[PDB]
Nucleic acid binder design. Structure first.
Lengths: 59, 59
DNA sequence: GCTTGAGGATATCCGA
DNA sequence: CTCGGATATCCTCAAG
């Protein structure tokens, strides 16, 4: 099994990230708890969030 | 097997990527091929280059 | 049909 | 068990 990130899951994810105060303050366990998605592990979120954090470079 | 990216090995990589017009134009075959380090695959090099091309790491 | 390489997405590993 | 980071594997789509 290899998951992939439909756009609706991505939006749910980014809503969770935003509720936790941004990509930098959010952590996987939080994002997962908020998303409430079946068949989804902390590792799915961990990897996806690492990708998300590397779209913006802050000084 | 798991590689481990030394800092001066990373230098050689940067050196090479710069010989090839930077992170965007540079290619894994090309830069592996320019680095001439032994015990170094194309696969090591593409994973590293993917990390370097991101908006976070390219400066 | 092989055998490659490319970019991007996703998973697995390391050390704290 | 969690986190952040580093590194490898997978997929799709090419080329030769």
């Amino acid at each position: 099994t290899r998951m992939r990130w439909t756009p609706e899951l991505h939006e749910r994810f980014v809503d969770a990230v935003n509720l936790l105060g941004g990509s930098e303050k959010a952590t996987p366990k939080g994002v997962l708890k908020l998303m409430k998605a079946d068949n989804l592990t902390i590792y799915h979120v961990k990897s996806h969030l690492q990708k998300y954090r590397t779209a913006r470079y802050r000084p």
